[PDB]
Every structure is written in structure tokens, then in C-alpha cells.
Amino acid sequence: ETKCTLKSFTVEKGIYQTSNFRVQPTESIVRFPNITNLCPFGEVFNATRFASVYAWNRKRISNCVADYSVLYNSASFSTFKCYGVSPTKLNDLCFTNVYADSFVIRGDEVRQIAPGQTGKIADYNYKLPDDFTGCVIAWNSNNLDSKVGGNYNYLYRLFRKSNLKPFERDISTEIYQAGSTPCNGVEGFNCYFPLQSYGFQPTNGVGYQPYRVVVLSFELLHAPATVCGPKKSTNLVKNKCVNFNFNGLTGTGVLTESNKKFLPFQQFGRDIADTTDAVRDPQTLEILDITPCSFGGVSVITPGTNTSNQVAVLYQDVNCTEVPSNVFQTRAGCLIGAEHVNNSYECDIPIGAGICASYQTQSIIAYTMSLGAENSVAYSNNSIAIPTNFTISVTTEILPVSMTKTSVDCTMY
Amino acid sequence: YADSFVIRGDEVRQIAPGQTGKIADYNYKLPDDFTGCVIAWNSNNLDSKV
Amino acid sequence: ICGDSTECSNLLLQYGSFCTQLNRALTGIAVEQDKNTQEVFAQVKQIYKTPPIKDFGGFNFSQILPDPSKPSKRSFIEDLLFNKVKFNGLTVLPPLLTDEMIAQYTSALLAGTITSGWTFGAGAALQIPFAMQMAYRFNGIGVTQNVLYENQKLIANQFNSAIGKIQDSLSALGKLQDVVNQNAQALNTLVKQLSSNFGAISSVLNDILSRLDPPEAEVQIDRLITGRLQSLQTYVTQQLIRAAEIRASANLAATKMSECVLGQS
Amino acid sequence: ICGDSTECSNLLLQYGSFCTQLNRALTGIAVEQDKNTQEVFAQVKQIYK
Amino acid sequence: EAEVQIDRLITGRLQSLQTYVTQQLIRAAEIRASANLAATKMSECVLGQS
Amino acid sequence: AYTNSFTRGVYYPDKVFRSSVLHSTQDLFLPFFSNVTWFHANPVLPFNDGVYFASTEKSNIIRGWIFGTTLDSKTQSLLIVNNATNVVIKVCEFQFCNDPFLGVMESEFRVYSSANNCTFEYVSKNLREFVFKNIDGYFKIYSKHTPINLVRDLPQGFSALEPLVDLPIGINITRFQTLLALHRSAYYVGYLQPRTFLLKYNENGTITDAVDCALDPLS
Ligand SMILES: *[C@@H]1O[C@H](CO)[C@@H](O[C@@H]2O[C@H](CO)[C@@H](O)[C@H](O)[C@H]2NC(C)=O)[C@H](O)[C@H]1NC(C)=O
Ligand SMILES: *[C@@H]1O[C@H](CO)[C@@H](O[C@@H]2O[C@H](CO)[C@@H](O)[C@H](O)[C@H]2NC(C)=O)[C@H](O)[C@H]1NC(C)=O
Ligand SMILES: *[C@@H]1O[C@H](CO)[C@@H](O[C@@H]2O[C@H](CO)[C@@H](O)[C@H](O)[C@H]2NC(C)=O)[C@H](O)[C@H]1NC(C)=O
Ligand SMILES: *[C@@H]1O[C@H](CO)[C@@H](O[C@@H]2O[C@H](CO)[C@@H](O)[C@H](O)[C@H]2NC(C)=O)[C@H](O)[C@H]1NC(C)=O
Ligand SMILES: *[C@@H]1O[C@H](CO)[C@@H](O)[C@H](O)[C@H]1NC(C)=O
Ligand SMILES: *[C@@H]1O[C@H](CO)[C@@H](O)[C@H](O)[C@H]1NC(C)=O
Ligand SMILES: *[C@@H]1O[C@H](CO)[C@@H](O)[C@H](O)[C@H]1NC(C)=O
Ligand SMILES: *[C@@H]1O[C@H](CO)[C@@H](O)[C@H](O)[C@H]1NC(C)=O
Numbered sequence A: 001e002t003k004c005t006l007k008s009f010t011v012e013k014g015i016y017q018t019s020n021f022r023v024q025p026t027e028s029i030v031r032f033p034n035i036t037n038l039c040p041f042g043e044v045f046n047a048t049r050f051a052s053v054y055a056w057n058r059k060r061i062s063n064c065v066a067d068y069s070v071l072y073n074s075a076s077f078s079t080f081k082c083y084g085v086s087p088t089k090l091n092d093l094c095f096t097n098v099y100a101d102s103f104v105i106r107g108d109e110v111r112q113i114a115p116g117q118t119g120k121i122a123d124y125n126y127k128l129p130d131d132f133t134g135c136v137i138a139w140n141s142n143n144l145d146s147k148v149g150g151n152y153n154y155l156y157r158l159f160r161k162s163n164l165k166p167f168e169r170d171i172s173t174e175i176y177q178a179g180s181t182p183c184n185g186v187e188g189f190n191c192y193f194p195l196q197s198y199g200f201q202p203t204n205g206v207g208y209q210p211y212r213v214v215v216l217s218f219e220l221l222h223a224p225a226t227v228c229g230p231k232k233s234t235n236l237v238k239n240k241c242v243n244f245n246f247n248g249l250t251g252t253g254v255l256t257e258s259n260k261k262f263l264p265f266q267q268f269g270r271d272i273a274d275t276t277d278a279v280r281d282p283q284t285l286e287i288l289d290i291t292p293c294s295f296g297g298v299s300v301i302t303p304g305t306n307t308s309n310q311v312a313v314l315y316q317d318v319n320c321t322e323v324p325s326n327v328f329q330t331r332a333g334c335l336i337g338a339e340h341v342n343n344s345y346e347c348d349i350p351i352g353a354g355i356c357a358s359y360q361t362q363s364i365i366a367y368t369m370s371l372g373a374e375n376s377v378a379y380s381n382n383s384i385a386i387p388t389n390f391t392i393s394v395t396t397e398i399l400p401v402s403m404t405k406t407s408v409d410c411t412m413y
Numbered sequence B: 001y002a003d004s005f006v007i008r009g010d011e012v013r014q015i016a017p018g019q020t021g022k023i024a025d026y027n028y029k030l031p032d033d034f035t036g037c038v039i040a041w042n043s044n045n046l047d048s049k050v
Numbered sequence C: 001i002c003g004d005s006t007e008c009s010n011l012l013l014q015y016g017s018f019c020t021q022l023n024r025a026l027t028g029i030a031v032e033q034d035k036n037t038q039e040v041f042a043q044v045k046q047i048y049k050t051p052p053i054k055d056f057g058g059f060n061f062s063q064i065l066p067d068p069s070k071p072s073k074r075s076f077i078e079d080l081l082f083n084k085v086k087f088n089g090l091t092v093l094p095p096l097l098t099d100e101m102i103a104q105y106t107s108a109l110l111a112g113t114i115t116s117g118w119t120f121g122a123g124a125a126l127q128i129p130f131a132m133q134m135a136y137r138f139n140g141i142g143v144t145q146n147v148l149y150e151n152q153k154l155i156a157n158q159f160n161s162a163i164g165k166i167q168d169s170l171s172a173l174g175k176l177q178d179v180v181n182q183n184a185q186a187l188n189t190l191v192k193q194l195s196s197n198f199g200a201i202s203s204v205l206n207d208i209l210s211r212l213d214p215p216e217a218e219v220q221i222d223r224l225i226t227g228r229l230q231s232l233q234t235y236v237t238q239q240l241i242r243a244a245e246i247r248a249s250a251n252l253a254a255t256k257m258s259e260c261v262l263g264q265s
Numbered sequence D: 001i002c003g004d005s006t007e008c009s010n011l012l013l014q015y016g017s018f019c020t021q022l023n024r025a026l027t028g029i030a031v032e033q034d035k036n037t038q039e040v041f042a043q044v045k046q047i048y049k
Numbered sequence E: 001e002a003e004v005q006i007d008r009l010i011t012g013r014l015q016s017l018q019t020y021v022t023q024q025l026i027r028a029a030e031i032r033a034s035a036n037l038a039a040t041k042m043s044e045c046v047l048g049q050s
Numbered sequence F: 001a002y003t004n005s006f007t008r009g010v011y012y013p014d015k016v017f018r019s020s021v022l023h024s025t026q027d028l029f030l031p032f033f034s035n036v037t038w039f040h041a042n043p044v045l046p047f048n049d050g051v052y053f054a055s056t057e058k059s060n061i062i063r064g065w066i067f068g069t070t071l072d073s074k075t076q077s078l079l080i081v082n083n084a085t086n087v088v089i090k091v092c093e094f095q096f097c098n099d100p101f102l103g104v105m106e107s108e109f110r111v112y113s114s115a116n117n118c119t120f121e122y123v124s125k126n127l128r129e130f131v132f133k134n135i136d137g138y139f140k141i142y143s144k145h146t147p148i149n150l151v152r153d154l155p156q157g158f159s160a161l162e163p164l165v166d167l168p169i170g171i172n173i174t175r176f177q178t179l180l181a182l183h184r185s186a187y188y189v190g191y192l193q194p195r196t197f198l199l200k201y202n203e204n205g206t207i208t209d210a211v212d213c214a215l216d217p218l219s
């Protein structure tokens, strides 16, 4: 790797930065807010008394968290048709308003609650537009709504001047009108009330027993945001380089128990120079520090390929306990492949913090450099040393004065 | 290389590098550094029948 | 630049050897900082020691000789001076010499001077009594040497009072604080430059990447890369200009240590 | 760069602290120039005549 | 279409040339101080006794 | 009357803990030493960009605000109320009394006469500050309750306001009012502008001091 970094086949003695060491994290632990409520459907569904078919109800579900899965898979519904949108993709979309209409009809009249039908119900009781978007849900309710002797409280309209506009409602009771004639409020030849009543009985063949119906109609409009799907999560860990996501905060690192105290509306903490360094767990609400995961530089110590092919390796500032013989800990990192001796020589290859290396004792060794010999002057208050001879010495000193004059031609380059 | 096929009229905009849709997702995907050319012409009278 | 992401590394591979040059530039600077210190302080062959007595003609060097009751073995004035002064790819290497070693070089330079005058700077150390060395130095400034011997006590008292005034004047070092401040402040700007979009949608390499598809995202990631590479070039060029100023200062220090400590100027 | 234009100024904010750095560099070498001539000429305590 | 691709090369090559020219100024300022010291040593050690 | 705030209307710009760090922000603040209206006991005010709003009493005469563009039907509005029970946020189309209030028997609420098309519901001396703002369909509310040792005059001091609520409504707002409990048996209004401040953070992470950087040359 050193030969490749230098692009050569002979490396001279030195110390070379060759690559990098970066701990690796695994698994994608998720986190979010405790699974709160799940939209309001209590009344709207489990009501004790439904509404007539000629005056249906109209609940306007609003800003909430709607979970159409508890509906879709409840298996208690005899009919669950979705028109604008297939059912499984409901828990992944957002609209402006949901309306829920409720009523009670016969068993074989559930096929007129659909876009583009005809019949006494869809003509003038409850009409669905031709580009409907929602879903229609229906289930049998014989035991709740049918009573011995006949339940005559569930009426429907059977005469009207003109078919309803979609989602239009008509609770009037003004008498009808047969052939040309007055009939000032009073039954008789060609003329009569406009409302009839299902007489429901418990001994009625299916298709004659009461069914309860709920029509959900999603109507979009425009906004900045609203309800949406439910996010998943896991069980955060600690003391392990990890890849984490805390309800939006995406990062990497080791997570550790904290001892700081946020204010009870603050989610994460930042450092000077603006890096996220603490978070709060959304479920348990405890503060956790996020220290950068291990990492540094890797250096290769070689006596030179013209001497040997042995090598030692320095893992820049990193406890010799998580690197992956001679493992030796230095103030400059963890050294592998050199033995530590107790002697002290002149520095050869500088490691750092007073430590050098050499190819002597062979192999590679570590130690603390030597400042120099030790001379002890015999100083006294009346002693002098005087020289009796001399040497003539001559030394060299080398200095650069110039470098090469180069020219470039911008345009031609 | 020459590849040949038949699609709808408004699906010709998914035959291009870096698109999405039912055609480019899983029918025929063009790499992101494409080099060639894409040619297309209407053929209503040959391929559509009463 | 990139930082973890992998869509960034292949795009940055297209710029050639811009990052190899910057690492070479920064490594040269770091190797020069150890040679600065070797040239100022390792100006002595042997590690000289003062004798256990302190009979120096009435001169008192106790505030500048090493303190044996310490792990660091610094002097009193060196203790006064030392009480007054992981990230996104950033690392600080330690100096080759500890400052215990530096204090050990300085105390040996001091014991060479107090015991041998200027002879240890030209060869082997030749002991001479301190008053006689002081009298040699009075000759070097053109004063006759009985002026020293007839005023020895007064001259020693004046030295001792002037040495005493230095601690009070200490307990100044703004020239050493400026270097630390300018370097920390230039390193803080490089980190703050990572939260800027440079004209992309955002400044965080994931949100750009998980909200667009490759053809669309590569355009923004190239803008981020261009800005972040410009910031690093600005940083490295200024470190190169600032290290040449520190080198001219360490060169002046080496000449002063040679000419004012190892001789008389 | 912009010269009294707010459209340009808000786009210049997307590069961070480039202009703060540039002004800081240019001001430090204007301070050095007065130090330069103080170090050459004010080498005397009194004004002798 | 070739203008957009030629400009990407122009910008890169200009950057690289200007980096070369900055680092030469910084290296020449260091050779200059060495030659200034050599000129002082020639005066003070060769034409005198220091 | 008009009065002078001194250093009032500082709120935590967002989550994210923080300690001793003279952190610098650009946002909508109430400038230091401002000209705040004084009201005694009230009329339709503007909104135009956020609102500071303090109030002083031991009883509870201030019983919420009402917001919106027209304060009637034909367009939607917010309504924030508090009877002697607890807060009632609500968003319908209303018909508001031009002088709406609530009594104090203890029968009350002559506030509106219509509650149509509701698109959001919710149910459940002293100095009580509030900061109201409305950005990107969210209606943010910061608040703080400090105890005065006076009864009804604006004091001096520093106290940062902590976020309370967040409502994803979408509503447009141009006007607002107040609601008071009548007699049958003092409040201020500042406005917010885009300023730049320097906040000093404690070691627990609370804002203890600030600097308005456009007051004077020293700042
Ligand atoms: C979220 O739900 C979990 C359970 O699903 C809650 O955990 C409970 O915490 C209390 C501590 O006050 C324990 O006494 C219970 O035994 C825990 N329950 C379980 C099943 O472990 C948790 O408190 C909820 N979140 C919040 C904020 O309350
Ligand atoms: C009212 O509606 C609820 C929601 O669909 C019904 O609830 C569930 O009953 C099943 C038993 O088959 C349980 O496994 C679920 O846990 C229940 N859901 C809840 C409450 O989370 C409920 O049955 C309906 N009313 C009744 C009593 O029949
Ligand atoms: C001073 O030193 C010189 C050596 O530098 C001495 O001369 C040497 O003497 C030895 C023994 O007589 C010879 O082997 C060498 O050849 C001599 N060296 C040279 C260069 O001629 C000299 O004797 C010494 N003088 C005194 C007084 O001690
Ligand atoms: C050298 O000077 C120091 C003063 O800096 C002397 O130490 C002080 O001596 C006085 C009395 O002379 C004491 O009151 C102080 O407590 C001493 N300070 C210390 C010991 O830190 C020291 O005695 C002098 N040396 C000699 C040999 O006289
Ligand atoms: C390098 O190799 C040559 C020949 O193999 C040898 O003469 C020389 O001593 C070697 N250098 C070192 C430093 O070992
Ligand atoms: C490395 O970690 C161990 C375990 O906590 C610790 O004892 C040791 O002191 C650490 N290394 C250094 C240099 O402190
Ligand atoms: C070095 O000397 C120390 C003295 O404290 C001793 O404890 C240690 O074992 C020695 N090291 C070796 C490798 O012998
Ligand atoms: C506030 O502005 C009004 C506007 O006329 C002015 O009369 C009043 O003096 C101002 N108050 C202060 C405290 O400046």
C-alpha cells in the first residue's frame, strides 16, 4: 500500500500516510413518538342507533390520524369496496377532508350505493356522484335493528319529483301529486304520503334483513400538511457505532447515556460550530450523547525496501483495543509490529510525543529519544580550566539560491 | 444495437435516461449515461384494429 | 467534502489530484513545525547540570533554575508562563518533543551558561567562577574589570531585584495568544462552511439524495462539492502563508539563542 | 460583487463567510502597515534638537 | 450542447493553473530568503572575519 | 396611552438544547425599547406580522383572543377561549358579535352566534406574556407566566418565552381581538419585525440575556 501510494517500487526511509481507518456501523434502528390515538371512529361506527335512509347522517372527520387498516382487515364487514383508490394504499395518502355518511337499508339494496346506479334508493334517497373517490362499507345488523312484530322506525322515500343531485338531501314531507288534480293535503285517488317504512322482522330471509352502511368520501382541496402513515421503529442501542434516525435526525455514531438536562420542549442539542451532539429519545424521553465514531489515519513505518521488507503500523490516536505480537500504546496512537525497549538512542524515525522507531534489535522497536549525552562541569568558586592545544576544523554549509524559470501559455494549456 | 417495441403515445417520454413509470421501471430501462438516439413515430393505422 | 456518502466519492474522483495536493501541502507544514523547535532548542551537545551548591558570587538564580518538586521539573517563571497561555476529517497531531523535553533542553542551556560562560558554545565546557566570568563580560562592553570586583555586592543586589520584578510584571504574552487564536478561528470557519448550500436545495448530502433521483441529484451534489472544495483551498493557502511567518520567527529565535545566550553580542 | 442590489445580496448569502474572511484578511494587512513604520522610525524616546 | 461541456473543462483547467501559480509564489518567497542569507554569509564570512 | 418595553418578547427560536453560547439569530422579534400600545378596561386590531401581548391581574378578565381576516362568516377564523373550566381552541366559520365578550348565575358567552363548518376543535399579581405568529399554515404560540409584585403596570426585566402550541390550520389572518369577563355581580400590544439578535445561553440551556444588534453603535 505504501508502494502504491508513492507510485514506486523502492521506498526510502520515512513515514508515509497510506490510508484511513473508519469503524463500521450496522443496522438501522428507528425511533419516533409513542403510538398515540388512531383517528376518531367510535361513534361513527359503533353507534347504538343508526340514521334513516332518507335523512342520512353526515359526520365531517377532520385533522386526525386515520388508520384504515383496522377497518380494512376487521373481517366483520360484508362489503368493503373502494373506488377512487384501492384499499391498501389508504394508510399512505393525505387529503383535506373525509366525510362519513351513515344509514340503514335492506340487504339487497347495497348494490345501489355505488357510482352510476338506479333504483328507489339511489334515485331519491342518497345519490353518489359519478366520479366518487371514497369507499363504501356495509355489514349485516339483523340482531340490532330488527325486532319481533316489526321495527317500523326505519323509513325511506319512495316518491319524488326528480332524482337527487349527488350528495343532496331531502327531508320534506309535503304530499305527492298523482294525475292532474289539486289534492290540498289529503290522500285519495292518485295522491299519497311519500314515506314508507321497512317493517323489519327477525325471521326475514337474507336480503330482507337490515344492513348498516357507512360511505367514506375523501375530498381533497389544499393545505401545507396533515394526516399520514404511521412510522416504524426499533430498540436503539449504546456503545456501538450505529446508523440512527431519531424522528427525522439522520446520523451515525456511538450513542451513550447522558447527564445533561434539556428543557422539556427541546429535542436535540448542538455544539459550537453547529453539529448535533445530543438527542432525546421520543419514546422514553432520555438524553443521549452522540460522539463521533472511531476514526483516524494509518501510517506505515519502514526501514526502506533496500534494507528489509518488514513494516510497522501506526493507527493515529486510537486505543489499542478496537484496532481490528507487539501492540504498544503511545500518546500518538496504537503501534503494531515494533517492540518497546528500555534503552534510549538518537531519534531515527519520528513517531511522536517523544517516541521514535528504528530497525535495530532484527525488527522494529519503540522508546523515548535521547536529548544527548551527559556532561558534568566541575564548577567551584576558585577553579578554572584552560586549553593546552587546538584543532583546525572545517565544515560545510549548503544553501539554495535559485530555482527554475518556467513559463506557461494559458491559451495553449 | 437497435431495440424495437411498441408503446402508447404518451409513454414515449419515459424512454430517456433517468425517468420513472410503469414502462421505464419494469419494461425497458435506459442507463444513466446513455449514448445513442431514440426514434419514435406514430403507427395508428398498422397496429390498431376495430 | 463528501463525508460518508458514496454518490459523492465517485463524483469527486472526477477532479483529479486536487485532494492529494492539499494533503501534501498540510503534511509539509506539520513536518516544518518540528524542525522549528529542533532548531531553536536542541542547540547543545550534552545535558549539563548545575552543582548542588549555589555559590555564584552572591547571584541568585533560583527563580529560573528547575524545580525538583514537580513532575514537569519546570522553573518558577516557566510555571508562571504556562498558566497564562474529533470532527469531519480534522485531526491534531502531537509534537515530537514533549515540553518536558523542552524544559530539559532549556535548563541545560542555563547550566552551561552559569558554569562555563561562553566556552560550551564553541567546544567543551570549561568551568570558570561566576564573578570572574562577569568581569570578562564587563570588559566586553568597555568597562574596566575592577569596576565589577569593587562593586560586586551592589551589582548582585541589582540583578536580584531586577529578577524579582519580572515575576510581578508577569503574575505580555499576547504574541503567543494571537497565533493560537488565529489558528482556532481559521479552523472554526472551515467547519461552519459545511452548513451552506452554495446554491443547491440543501446543505446535507442525504436530504438532497433521498428527495431526488440520480440525474437530478448529481447536479446539486456537484454544486456542494464545488463550494466545499473552494473552502478547503482557501484554508490550506492561508495556512501556507501563516506558516512561513512562523518560520521567519523561529529563525530569529535560533539566531538569538546562538548569539545572546551562547555568547556576548 | 452586487453593488446595491438586494436580489444579488440574498444569493450571496448562500456561500457563507467568504466576504467576512476577505475583509478580515485585508484589514490585518492594513494594521501591519502602521506597525511597520512604528518599528522603523519611533526608535527614540525624546525629541532631540 | 458542446458549449456546456467545454465550459466545465475550462473552469477546471483554470483552477488548476491558478493553483500552480499560487504555490510557486509561496515557494519563491522561501527561496528568496535563503538567497538573502547566502548573500549575507558571503559578505560576512568570506570577505570578513565574523 | 403608550408605554415603553425594555427587554421583552424574547422566545426560543426552536427546539435543540444549548448552553453558554452567545448564539446569533435572524427572526421576527419585538425590538428593544419599543412603543407598545396601552389598553384599559376592546377594539379590532391588526396582525400584519406576529404579536406580543402581555396582561396583568389576579382575577381573570382576559379570557382569550379571536383571530382571522373578517371575524365573521364567509371566511374562516380561529377562536381561543377559556371559561372557568379550561381552554377551548376552535376553528369554524363564525358570526362574531362586533362587541363580543362573556359575563360573570355566572352565565356568559355572548361572543358569537354561529359555529358552522368547524375544521378543528379542542376542549379539555400576575404577568402573562404571549407571542403569536403564523407561518406556512402553522399558527405558533409562545408564552410565559411571570409573577409581578405589582398589580397592573408593565415591569422591567428579562424573561424568555417557551413554545406552547402548534396548529396546522392553513387559516389566513389579518385581524384579531380580545375577550373580557364583564361586571355583573390592562393589556399591551406590540408587533414583530425581522431583526437580528445575540442570545446568551446558560449552562442549563436557558436564555438569560440578549442583545438587539440594531439599537445603537455599541450593540
Ligand atoms: C409509551 O408506551 C409505553 C408502553 O407501551 C410506556 O411505558 C410504560 O412506562 C411506565 C413508566 O411510567 C411503566 O411503569 C410501564 O410499565 C411502561 N409500560 C410498558 C408496557 O413497558 C411509556 O411510558 C409510554 N410513553 C410515555 C411518554 O408515557
Ligand atoms: C367497536 O369497534 C372496535 C374497533 O374495530 C371493535 O374492536 C376490536 O375487537 C377485536 C375483537 O375481535 C379486538 O381484537 C380489538 O382489539 C378491538 N379493537 C380495539 C378496541 O382496539 C369492537 O369490537 C367494536 N364494538 C364491539 C364491542 O363489538
Ligand atoms: C597537540 O595536538 C597534536 C595533534 O593534533 C599533537 O601532535 C600529534 O602528536 C602525535 C604524537 O606525537 C603524533 O602521532 C601526531 O602525528 C601529531 N599530529 C600531527 C597533526 O602532527 C601535539 O603533540 C599536541 N601538542 C601538545 C603540546 O600536546
Ligand atoms: C533567592 O531568591 C529567593 C527569592 O525569590 C529567595 O527565596 C525567598 O527568601 C525569602 C527570605 O530571603 C523568603 O521569605 C521567601 O519565602 C523565599 N521564597 C521561596 C523560598 O520561594 C532565596 O532564598 C534566594 N536564595 C538564596 C540562596 O538566598
Ligand atoms: C541500497 O542498495 C545498494 C545495492 O543493493 C547498496 O549498495 C546500498 O548500501 C543500499 N543502501 C542502504 C541504505 O542500505
Ligand atoms: C483506553 O480505554 C481504557 C478503557 O477505559 C482506559 O483504561 C485507557 O486509559 C484508555 N486509554 C488512554 C490512553 O487513556
Ligand atoms: C523497563 O524498565 C522498567 C522499570 O520500571 C521495568 O518495569 C520494565 O519491565 C522494563 N521493560 C522491559 C521491556 O524490560
Ligand atoms: C409612540 O408613537 C406615537 C405616535 O404618534 C407617539 O405619539 C408617541 O410619543 C410614541 N411613544 C414613544 C414612547 O415614543
Ligand SMILES: *[C@@H]1O[C@H](CO)[C@@H](O)[C@H](O)[C@H]1NC(C)=O
Binding pocket: F081, F083, F085, F086, F088, F123
Ligand atoms: C366551556 O366552554 C366550552 C366552549 O364550547 C364548552 O364546550 C364547555 O362546556 C364550557 N364549560 C362548561 C362547564 O360548560
Ligand SMILES: *[C@@H]1O[C@H](CO)[C@@H](O)[C@H](O)[C@H]1NC(C)=O
Binding pocket: F116, F117
Ligand atoms: C360551509 O357552510 C355553508 C353554509 O352552512 C355551506 O353552504 C358550505 O357548503 C360549507 N362548506 C363546505 C365545504 O361544505
Ligand SMILES: *[C@@H]1O[C@H](CO)[C@@H](O)[C@H](O)[C@H]1NC(C)=O
Binding pocket: F170, F171, F172
Ligand atoms: C391569503 O390571502 C391572500 C390575499 O392576497 C391570498 O392570495 C392567499 O391565497 C390566502 N391564503 C391562502 C392559503 O389561500
Ligand SMILES: *[C@@H]1O[C@H](CO)[C@@H](O)[C@H](O)[C@H]1NC(C)=O
Binding pocket: A261, F202, F203, F204
Ligand atoms: C441550573 O442552573 C443553575 C445556575 O446556572 C445551576 O446551579 C443548576 O445546577 C442548574 N440545574 C438545575 C437547577 O437543575
